[PDB]
Amino acid sequence: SREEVESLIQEVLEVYPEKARKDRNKHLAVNAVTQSKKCIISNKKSQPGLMTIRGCAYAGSKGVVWGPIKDMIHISHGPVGCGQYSRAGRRNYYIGTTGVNAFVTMNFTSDFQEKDIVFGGDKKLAKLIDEVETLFPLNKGISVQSECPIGLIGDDIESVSKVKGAELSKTIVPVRCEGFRGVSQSLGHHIANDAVRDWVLGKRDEDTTFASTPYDVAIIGDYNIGGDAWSSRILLEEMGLRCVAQWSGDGSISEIELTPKVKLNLVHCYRSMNYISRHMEEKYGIPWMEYNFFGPTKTIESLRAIAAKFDESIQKKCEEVIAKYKPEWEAVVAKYRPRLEGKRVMLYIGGLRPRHVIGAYEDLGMEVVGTGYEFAHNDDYDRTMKEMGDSTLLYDDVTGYEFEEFVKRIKPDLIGSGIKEKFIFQKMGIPFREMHSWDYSGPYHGFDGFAIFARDMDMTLNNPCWKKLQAPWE
Amino acid sequence: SREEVESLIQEVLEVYPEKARKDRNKHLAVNDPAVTQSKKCIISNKKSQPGLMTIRGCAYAGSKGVVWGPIKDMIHISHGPVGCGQYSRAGRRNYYIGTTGVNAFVTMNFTSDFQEKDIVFGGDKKLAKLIDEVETLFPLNKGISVQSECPIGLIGDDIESVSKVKGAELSKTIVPVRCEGFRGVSQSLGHHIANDAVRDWVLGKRDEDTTFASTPYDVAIIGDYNIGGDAWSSRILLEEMGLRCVAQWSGDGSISEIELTPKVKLNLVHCYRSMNYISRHMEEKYGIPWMEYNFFGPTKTIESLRAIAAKFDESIQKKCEEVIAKYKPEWEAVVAKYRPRLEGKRVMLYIGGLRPRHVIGAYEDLGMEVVGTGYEFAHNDDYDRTMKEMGDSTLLYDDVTGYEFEEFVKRIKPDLIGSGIKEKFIFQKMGIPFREMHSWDYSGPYHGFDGFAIFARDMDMTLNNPCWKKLQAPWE
Amino acid sequence: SQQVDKIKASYPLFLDQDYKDMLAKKRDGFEEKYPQDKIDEVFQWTTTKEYQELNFQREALTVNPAKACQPLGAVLCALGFEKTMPYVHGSQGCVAYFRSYFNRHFREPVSCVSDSMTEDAAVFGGQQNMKDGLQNCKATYKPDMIAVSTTCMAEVIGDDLNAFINNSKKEGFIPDEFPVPFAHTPAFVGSHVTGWDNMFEGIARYFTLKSMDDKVVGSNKKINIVPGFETYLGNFRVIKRMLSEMGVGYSLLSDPEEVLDTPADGQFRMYAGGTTQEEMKDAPNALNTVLLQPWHLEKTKKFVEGTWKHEVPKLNIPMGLDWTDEFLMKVSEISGQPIPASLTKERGRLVDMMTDSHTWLHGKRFALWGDPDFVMGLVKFLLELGCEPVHILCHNGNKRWKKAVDAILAASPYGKNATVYIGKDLWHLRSLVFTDKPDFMIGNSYGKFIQRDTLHKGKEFEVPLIRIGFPIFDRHHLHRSTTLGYEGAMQILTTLVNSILERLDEETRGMQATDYNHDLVR
Amino acid sequence: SQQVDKIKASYPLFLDQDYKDMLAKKRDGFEEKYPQDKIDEVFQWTTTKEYQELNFQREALTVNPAKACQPLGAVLCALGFEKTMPYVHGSQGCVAYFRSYFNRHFREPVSCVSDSMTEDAAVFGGQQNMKDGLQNCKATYKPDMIAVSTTCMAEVIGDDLNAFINNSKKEGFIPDEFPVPFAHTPAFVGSHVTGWDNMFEGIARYFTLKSMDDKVVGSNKKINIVPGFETYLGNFRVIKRMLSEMGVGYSLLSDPEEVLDTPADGQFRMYAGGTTQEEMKDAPNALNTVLLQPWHLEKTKKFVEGTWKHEVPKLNIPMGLDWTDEFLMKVSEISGQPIPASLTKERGRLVDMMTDSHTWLHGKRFALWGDPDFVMGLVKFLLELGCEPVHILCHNGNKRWKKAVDAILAASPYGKNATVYIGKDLWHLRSLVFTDKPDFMIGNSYGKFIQRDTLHKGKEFEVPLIRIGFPIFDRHHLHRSTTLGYEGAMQILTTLVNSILERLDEETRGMQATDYNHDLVR
Ligand code: ICS
Ligand code: ICS
Ligand SMILES: [Fe+3]
Ligand SMILES: [Fe+3]
Ligand code: NA
Ligand code: NA
């Protein structure tokens, strides 16, 4: 630890040319670290040719934020690649009749050909909007998720959206999330939050119809991966709150449009949703707080903090919820912590989970020896410092070579990352769990999710397959 | 070519040792219209010569397999070692309506599973124990039959005493059947043994019955085992004609139906071979007449519907013509589509005891020509009837050997062969289309008008299948 | 009625209204059938804790066995020798059954003869059947060898096969030098696998016993391979493939893969390939003899050790990862050949598939049945996969075998909820999948009626069948599959994980009800 | 809530009563959702002929495409060369998508890099991204070759790939002799298969064009084999297996079988196998070049004929019986090698399986989709099997291709009710399987949502999916299968007939209702 990590960091960097070596030195840190500014830099350009795990601003808008909105149709405006590669790849679960009143797992696209590059796609988009309205009459809004060429060729999707929106009396949201904008999916979050603000959030500011209650609340930044938000709202409503809306996991446009009515915004994913949360505080006065539903420790801390923002009845029901699920998650730790205690885990995820799931691992007696983000910011890393232990390894926008080399020396018993990393480390004999798609399992949020998370970590870490990597004859 | 068929016959016999050569010569004949004696063209119902690979089965297959098995609300005990019940388990598609394991048991395999200890001391005590265990686990069975396999008689057991003692103990029908595989020469004796077991232990159970409400049009289907639904597609037509089918033997048949058969006015015999025995007894004991009929193809079905109807009154004959006129466009559509696709093609058949002659008219209704048929276990009265169905100079073969059947095909080169499961893949590899005329190749039904459509569709899909053009590699 | 353009077969023809009313009238008029509510009550009773206890009290009645009789295996064993005609001394009905049983599983011709012993032969023996039978068979079908077994009729009356064949040679029905190996195969002893063992030993007897004086162990530098009762073509082919890859000289003793898979090129081939008589005569010169399925090759083992003087290695069936490893390591020791890079890589690819598929396999509960060696190899592989073999049924197993399997279950936490049953049948197993419901069954085609029953209680209670074993009659060409070695472990793994995923897809197909979990990616 | 010994995943956890009511209150309170009967009305409308006519009037909107973009295929093509790193000049988000797309189909690592071109490259080009990109990749991941393609951003702004790589060598970012082939792959032209063609031609260009003077056609007595966009490991392996059996010297140009199937033996291999740079340099010396999927290898074709002077044979994809025959007969003619007994027997075994299964395949109707060559080969095989390919959809096909397939359908009575659709997507196909319902679909994993839709109308209307094609995400290890040659035809036949029979068993499983046709033997 300490000098042992610092020397691992320089040792692996000696393979790079100096410009890449100098840059990547700034993105590798070991944990007076109250201030990220001061030990690691983040949210910068990726080095060319180093195999970044990052995505694009389209993935940050269409993939994560806009796609999950279930009663709207989201148009991948541009060539066929982006809509197809992201078709149903993120498990933003929802209730709906797909193709009729819900459209999350479908792929709508303008399928740019060269003719559209030459002459522009603005006329094709207007014709496409009409075809959507004839064939999918029960959609309650349309978004246009711009892919790379749209801005480069000089289209004006805002004019199409404004012209067509009036002709059809329909919500049409232009989103300028072209993949070359930004350094990652992060700017796609920001671009998508502003598109929500400008074209959707203000439609019911003067509409004071909705009957409000003092306990109205909204879940901000839960995309219902495997049902994560469903396993979270049940706890809030058992506590006596009314979840008016979830953004964007199983979210409807009406739900979003009613969010200005709530008393408190509950922010799970700070990174992707802090922008709109601050804006609703400025314009509508609604306060917002961050919370954590990963593992029993963090969930209880969050339920009691949320309840403290209301009256004694809500705080009372909070303790009733806590007492109800206490024996359930105690049985889970009693079963699984003996099988996972003392095991060390390395993580690498997007912009929240790398810090958000640490408490859950520790609830099973595991030690997070290394975490990192693809596209986090210094305020994400400030928050990471408190959660990580002394002498742990920190890495921002890690290279595949860096991540391999780090695993080789640290030798964790489990790795938590994405699909592009999974089969590398499985071949190295290290148990791997996907911390994006939950490995097609989940939910992992709340008390119901902790049981699945613990079962999933156990089944993989202790699997008999891991003792068979070496042929008995070598 | 009668001369060439007879030289083909001698040629194939030249392989055999002399005892086999003298016997097989008597079972291979060429039909001649100047002669329907049978007792002068061919011999049948004889020994199978050892070591010549007979397609025949045993008397157990003729009793448990054919007649008793299909009875759906009885449990049938394969009494003996593990083999027979297992090899016969759900092999014949005697279709039925029932809840299998609860009130129906056709597709299951009940057996005493003889160990050596049952050979030494005898299986009579084990059988009584088994009857009780059947009664505990399957309370809704309406009768039990014990199908004796090879060793039962060999070791000297008495299933008849067990059956009478346990039958009285439980006031249940328990039928001992002496169908050991070594009895007889083929499945045929199993038919006869099973018919006598029915007569002796079941048929007379309601002789003093006076409750059955009788109608003038009561009838029974005798010798239809509902292969793929053959009897259901035959019953629809008789009841549309105005008749009431009291019973069906054994296809989808219940014991109560069997017990009510003495009440009917007329016994309709499809399979003469397996069921002529009990039909004669019901005519002698109860006075019920019986007639043979044919529901293969539109020609024979219409001829049969009009002959059956003529045995009743004018109202039934009127409805007979109504049925005929109703299905007329349907089977005409089938012929218009498929006969052009099958006309002029030659068929060779080899089946069991009825179908080798019974399906000829259906092939001709699609314009095909049966150049050769044969039975595994027929008698000379089956061959007498085959002589009026078969054409001049065609080849007939009784208990044909695998070598004989192969050689015959090589010279005659039929466009289609209809036979059994052990023959199908031999001729498919020779590039000749094959259709299974036992299990209908898991298709069917083939009886009645509804069955002719399936039969015609099945012959077309196989004879004209593209796969047959590809047997020879283009570089060979 | 029929519409000519759309012919209906029995299904769904008999669902037409007129057929449905007729079937209703047939039942109500003349069937005297228990009322439906009485049928429902009893069906529910047959699924219960109670019924099972009574079900397991059975001593005399067997229902739905999971085994065949000896001469079936003797036939399959004989088909593995060159131009050999299997010959069952006894009654003809057995042979038609043996042939049909294998016809339907292999979808191929199966050549086999009887000597048609009748009622009269029961009283004075079947010696005349033997003399004429051999002579006819040799002259008609022209085999180079006739391998003789028995039906249960011949056994009980006491026909001496040895004397009968000798007298057939004495009186000139067959030449004296013509090979006629024999073996008594009583159907009331053991099962079909015992007939395989008895037949192979008889054939090994014939070509070896009197010629040992010239034999030197290991002089031919080969290893003898005895596969046992085997009905997957890929299992014969994978064993020869791995040995050739290692450069190991071997002799597969009984090899029917050619006769059970002849090409359809316009002619019928009665015989094809198989173990040559010379390979049998030279087998004592092998370094050793490996039994692929030792739990039903006990008699062969005693002869290979007693007469050939080979020290047969203690090897499990090469199923799964560890036991294929052990098979390859033992072959390497005997032959001196190293395990090549090709087989070490194939192993790593199997392990790779285990790592990619373990999240869906872990904890899955299975009921399974089959022959003793096939079953324990399936047990071991399921444990290696993280699955639980909850119901392990082997109708023709014995106590020693059950103890070896129980020891295997004890060495893995996934054997905690497992029970091994011998002498029990598929009606016993029906009770188990209702009382202690698993997720799937791994078994032969008879298991389809158990899934049938489970669905009737409810879709929630349905236990889908995964078809591995013998016989498989209701699917086409699964007899081409492989279950041994890494290749067979790869096929079993894929079948299992995809059966799980197909069932998950079925349960999450309901729109707006359960299709939130109808993931594109799994 | 959760039961510790039985944890519920998202399915069926969310079916619990408390979750059901919560989801009901969320919908009624805040979703403002259309009434259920209005949803049913619209769903039923979307299944009608009316709707289909409107669906097919689409000009701008594409829904559920059945194709990807060019650089995806360029990446796959590059992964088939020895120690080659695919490198896509453009934006990084594409590469994460390409890798994840192939990660989930192959369940394997996929190595691919980008040079992270940003908003700033829009104004001044991506030349600094090329110089630093090549240098970093070459230094960090130690490739022997870097194969360069483009994202659509790089294409629109006009980056000169040739000048950028040449200047990267001039100013010393990479060595001058370091192999850097390139190809422009605009995502707005053609589809993913076009990118494969563009990349392969670029690589063939690189190693040959400037060196043709020393080349003599046929001097290395080899045959060049170009597989095209291929995602079944067994298809690479069956081609190499048949040629080795024939004793034909060959060079598989682009062969990713090793890197897409590395063993899990404790270490991660970034590179494995692949076509060597020499096999590309020496390819002009081959007797000829056979294109395995010619309908997306036209650019390659022109270069092999224009520059290597090879007379590329007119061969269809080797799928099914006739086209494998023609493939083998043409290879025999070019190489002078005769077709061996092993391949002649394997052919007869495939024909045998056709004869054994034709009664269940005959007349069966299929809706199918995929890439052009895969589709027409599937059509051809389905016609050889007596089945009717009623709906033939190829989203990335062209007019000449459609004409070749239409000619194929016309030469067989089983193509009579068939229509070929190009430029149409899976939303079009959804309509076809409703208005003109077939029996099954043969397609990739996206087809699962069509079966979902069909089942919702009714069980009678459900069209089960048979997964053959790319990508297959919801089953494990189907990428190991084979679709080419006799072996691939044997796998397809078995898959098809058993899908038919599994559906028959499902429909005849209802006790007392339909199980009269629940035959043990089929
Ligand atoms: S939105 Fe973000 S990369 Fe906060 S873009 Fe990404 S469903 Fe990750 S760490 Mo995929 S900032 Fe969500 C995320 Fe976290 S798609 Fe999911 S797992 S909590
Ligand atoms: S009973 Fe007979 S062998 Fe008449 S034993 Fe056999 S179901 Fe055959 S020619 Mo299988 S006398 Fe029936 C018969 Fe015909 S079993 Fe079926 S087809 S009409
Ligand atoms: Fe076959
Ligand atoms: Fe893998
Ligand atoms: Na017998
Ligand atoms: Na992109």
PDB file of N, CA, C and O in Angstrom, chain A residues 377-391:
ATOM      1  N   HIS A 377     -16.445  13.806 -12.569  1.00  0.00           N
ATOM      2  CA  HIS A 377     -15.871  15.154 -12.399  1.00  0.00           C
ATOM      3  C   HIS A 377     -15.231  15.198 -11.030  1.00  0.00           C
ATOM      4  O   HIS A 377     -15.406  14.249 -10.295  1.00  0.00           O
ATOM      5  N   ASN A 378     -14.573  16.293 -10.713  1.00  0.00           N
ATOM      6  CA  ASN A 378     -13.864  16.460  -9.438  1.00  0.00           C
ATOM      7  C   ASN A 378     -14.883  16.448  -8.304  1.00  0.00           C
ATOM      8  O   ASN A 378     -14.492  16.051  -7.274  1.00  0.00           O
ATOM      9  N   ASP A 379     -16.124  16.889  -8.498  1.00  0.00           N
ATOM     10  CA  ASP A 379     -17.068  16.795  -7.389  1.00  0.00           C
ATOM     11  C   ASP A 379     -17.492  15.351  -7.148  1.00  0.00           C
ATOM     12  O   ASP A 379     -17.852  14.995  -6.021  1.00  0.00           O
ATOM     13  N   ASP A 380     -17.443  14.507  -8.183  1.00  0.00           N
ATOM     14  CA  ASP A 380     -17.631  13.075  -7.972  1.00  0.00           C
ATOM     15  C   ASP A 380     -16.454  12.472  -7.219  1.00  0.00           C
ATOM     16  O   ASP A 380     -16.633  11.573  -6.389  1.00  0.00           O
ATOM     17  N   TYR A 381     -15.239  12.950  -7.499  1.00  0.00           N
ATOM     18  CA  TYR A 381     -14.067  12.396  -6.837  1.00  0.00           C
ATOM     19  C   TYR A 381     -13.924  12.902  -5.410  1.00  0.00           C
ATOM     20  O   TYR A 381     -13.488  12.144  -4.542  1.00  0.00           O
ATOM     21  N   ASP A 382     -14.318  14.149  -5.137  1.00  0.00           N
ATOM     22  CA  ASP A 382     -14.394  14.606  -3.754  1.00  0.00           C
ATOM     23  C   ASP A 382     -15.261  13.659  -2.933  1.00  0.00           C
ATOM     24  O   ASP A 382     -14.870  13.210  -1.850  1.00  0.00           O
ATOM     25  N   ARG A 383     -16.446  13.332  -3.454  1.00  0.00           N
ATOM     26  CA  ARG A 383     -17.332  12.387  -2.787  1.00  0.00           C
ATOM     27  C   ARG A 383     -16.712  10.999  -2.697  1.00  0.00           C
ATOM     28  O   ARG A 383     -16.985  10.258  -1.747  1.00  0.00           O
ATOM     29  N   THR A 384     -15.875  10.629  -3.667  1.00  0.00           N
ATOM     30  CA  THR A 384     -15.241   9.318  -3.630  1.00  0.00           C
ATOM     31  C   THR A 384     -14.202   9.223  -2.519  1.00  0.00           C
ATOM     32  O   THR A 384     -13.989   8.138  -1.968  1.00  0.00           O
ATOM     33  N   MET A 385     -13.551  10.334  -2.172  1.00  0.00           N
ATOM     34  CA  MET A 385     -12.474  10.280  -1.187  1.00  0.00           C
ATOM     35  C   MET A 385     -12.980   9.797   0.167  1.00  0.00           C
ATOM     36  O   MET A 385     -12.317   8.993   0.835  1.00  0.00           O
ATOM     37  N   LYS A 386     -14.133  10.282   0.592  1.00  0.00           N
ATOM     38  CA  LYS A 386     -14.712   9.902   1.894  1.00  0.00           C
ATOM     39  C   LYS A 386     -15.094   8.423   1.890  1.00  0.00           C
ATOM     40  O   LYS A 386     -14.973   7.788   2.942  1.00  0.00           O
ATOM     41  N   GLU A 387     -15.525   7.885   0.751  1.00  0.00           N
ATOM     42  CA  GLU A 387     -16.010   6.515   0.705  1.00  0.00           C
ATOM     43  C   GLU A 387     -14.888   5.498   0.616  1.00  0.00           C
ATOM     44  O   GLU A 387     -15.023   4.388   1.153  1.00  0.00           O
ATOM     45  N   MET A 388     -13.786   5.849  -0.030  1.00  0.00           N
ATOM     46  CA  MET A 388     -12.684   4.917  -0.197  1.00  0.00           C
ATOM     47  C   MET A 388     -11.778   4.943   1.030  1.00  0.00           C
ATOM     48  O   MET A 388     -11.738   5.915   1.791  1.00  0.00           O
ATOM     49  N   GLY A 389     -11.053   3.843   1.220  1.00  0.00           N
ATOM     50  CA  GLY A 389     -10.149   3.709   2.340  1.00  0.00           C
ATOM     51  C   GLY A 389      -8.781   4.294   2.046  1.00  0.00           C
ATOM     52  O   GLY A 389      -8.485   4.755   0.944  1.00  0.00           O
ATOM     53  N   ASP A 390      -7.940   4.282   3.075  1.00  0.00           N
ATOM     54  CA  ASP A 390      -6.567   4.736   2.928  1.00  0.00           C
ATOM     55  C   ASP A 390      -5.808   3.815   1.982  1.00  0.00           C
ATOM     56  O   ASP A 390      -5.988   2.595   1.995  1.00  0.00           O
ATOM     57  N   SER A 391      -4.970   4.415   1.143  1.00  0.00           N
ATOM     58  CA  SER A 391      -4.019   3.716   0.284  1.00  0.00           C
ATOM     59  C   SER A 391      -4.669   2.972  -0.877  1.00  0.00           C
ATOM     60  O   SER A 391      -3.983   2.202  -1.565  1.00  0.00           O
TER      61      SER A 391
END
